[PDB]
Amino acid sequence: EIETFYKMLTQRAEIDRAFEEAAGSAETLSVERLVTFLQHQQREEEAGPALALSLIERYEPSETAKAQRQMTKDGFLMYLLSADGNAFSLAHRRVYQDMDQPLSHYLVSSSHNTYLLEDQLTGPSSTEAYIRALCKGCRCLELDCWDGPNQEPIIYHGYTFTSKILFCDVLRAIRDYAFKASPYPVILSLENHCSLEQQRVMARHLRAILGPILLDQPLDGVTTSLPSPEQLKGKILLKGKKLKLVPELSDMIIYCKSVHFGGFSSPGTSGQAFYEMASFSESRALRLLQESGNGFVRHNVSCLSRIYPAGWRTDSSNYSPVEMWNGGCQIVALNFQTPGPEMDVYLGCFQDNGGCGYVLKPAFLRDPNTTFNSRALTQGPWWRPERLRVRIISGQQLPKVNKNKNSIVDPKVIVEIHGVGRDTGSRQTAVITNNGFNPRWDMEFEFEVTVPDLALVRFMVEDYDSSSKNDFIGQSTIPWNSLKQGYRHVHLLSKNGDQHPSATLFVKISIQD
């Protein structure tokens, strides 16, 4: 029973079945059978002996089978639990997109009032807050600058009781972490409330601290468009007001002049310059989208738009980014300190493209002459309906997010489609009582998605509670085009975006036109 225990516990029928079905009679999977699996089941494009073999070399435990090119059930399982078996495309976990287009052509990971660790009114601010966001791949950060004691500019939330920090200290932290997660440009939004003197100080700190990382002159060339992430690789650019404002600072604002929203220019040629950036609150944005969906979209092809959370969100709660993305909005600022589905989707999106923080917009959101409007859908390249079938098979080692004794979680799984309104959907499985180790649901859902290029699939596991609100156990959000088919494991993340070493969901995904 000693091995029986381990062997009986550690046993997964769904895995057995799958191996069986793949290997048939054989106690092993030969390269040729693996290949067929990779193709027929996993739907790999690069399906072929080369892939199969690499998988075996990489995952097969048995020296015999390895040497003999074959895969045992164990190697099968190891593959399935690996980065290669991950429902989130391993290939997309490296920079793989065109990083040569104007910035306005990418979605950019953006943080709101980055300095804050908690609420907007009286919580603390910390350089730590900036370090975290940068470590989560954030590209656009916000600094709200005010005059401080001893001529040292400080940062905090204007007109509130939030704790304070030094502008210089923030700059050092940014300097130290700006590119730890990505090489692409970081943008610093300066909200300047400093006296001219302290403004001068800011400028000095900027130059002294960022030094050469700082972008202080236009790029030789780059005349009719914003540079590309590649062109600005390794640089930090300031965004703010350009000539109350000393030249020292104003002269540093190159490609992102803060401007008040003029309007959409189609009734003419131009409006805001490509080097001009407007901002919209959550509410205004929604309205503009509701009324002028296509203008906003078209506007966003050549211009960067920044969106920020409604003022009432003093709790640092977040809005859904998806709706802004659907309009081509790129600097969709969220409160990075706040766990929730909003940040879950946000970081799911930005895990794509190797998590570099710049994610290329779909082509139709890069066409100045587009008639797209996620709100009034018509025929177009964006319209490409797909049928998705997700079978929630089993769960493995779901963590306990509650009381001292493993009260044996009673898990259930929710699956959501986020995208254009038409596509948004959600479905939930039944609850398995008292089992986080290896619940088994075997439930399937099907969803029709018309605009897959803007869609994301989210898996969320809750702990059902009759009396109270169910506790969140784990989650994972996958951008549509990074969704892998066949049998895969979804690796659950915590509220804070941390990877749960052993908590997974075992599923089978199928997408068909």
Cβ–Cβ under 8 Å, residues 201 and 147: no
Q: Is 154 annotated as ligand-binding?
A: no
CA of residue 384 relative to chain centroid, distance: 23
Resolution stated for this PDB structure, in Å: 2.5
Which architecture does CATH list for 11-93?
Answer: Orthogonal Bundle (1.10)
Rounded to whole angstroms, how far apart are CA atoms 402 and 409?
Answer: 9
Which amino acid would we find at residue 64? T
Cβ–Cβ under 8 Å, residues 125 and 350: no
What values do phi and psi take at 479, rounded to 5?
-65, 135
Give the residue numbers annotated as catalytic, written as ranges.
112, 157
Q: Is 496 annotated as ligand-binding?
A: no
SS3 state at 338: coil
Domain ranges of the chain: 11-93, 94-382, 383-513
Q: Is 458 annotated as ligand-binding?
A: no
Longest distance between any two alpha carbons in the chain, whole Å: 81
Structure determined by: X-ray
Strands 499-512 and 456-463: unpaired
Go through the chain and tell me how many residues it has: 513
Q: Which fold does the domain 94-382 belong to in CATH?
A: TIM Barrel (3.20.20)
User: 139: which residues sit within 8 A by CB, 6+ positions away?
Assistant: 108, 109, 110, 182, 184, 185, 186, 187, 357, 358
What values do phi and psi take at 496, rounded to 5?
-85, 5
Q: Is 279 annotated as ligand-binding?
A: yes
Query: CATH number of the domain at 383-513, out of 2.60.40.10, 2.60.40.150, 3.20.20.70, 1.10.3130.10?
Result: 2.60.40.150
CB-hemisphere CA count at 13 Å for 390?
29
3-state secondary structure 234-251: CCEEEEECCCCCCHHHHC
Strands 456-463 and 411-418: antiparallel
Q: How many CB atoms lie within 10 A of CB 83?
A: 12
Rounded to whole angstroms, how far apart are CA atoms 400 and 471?
Answer: 9
Strand partners, 236: 186, 214
Cβ–Cβ under 8 Å, residues 489 and 456: no
Q: Is 442 annotated as ligand-binding?
A: no
CA dist 14 → 17, 32, 121, 144, 375 (Å): 5, 22, 51, 54, 41
Residue 474 DSSP symbol: E
Rounded to whole angstroms, how far apart are CA atoms 454 and 502?
Answer: 30
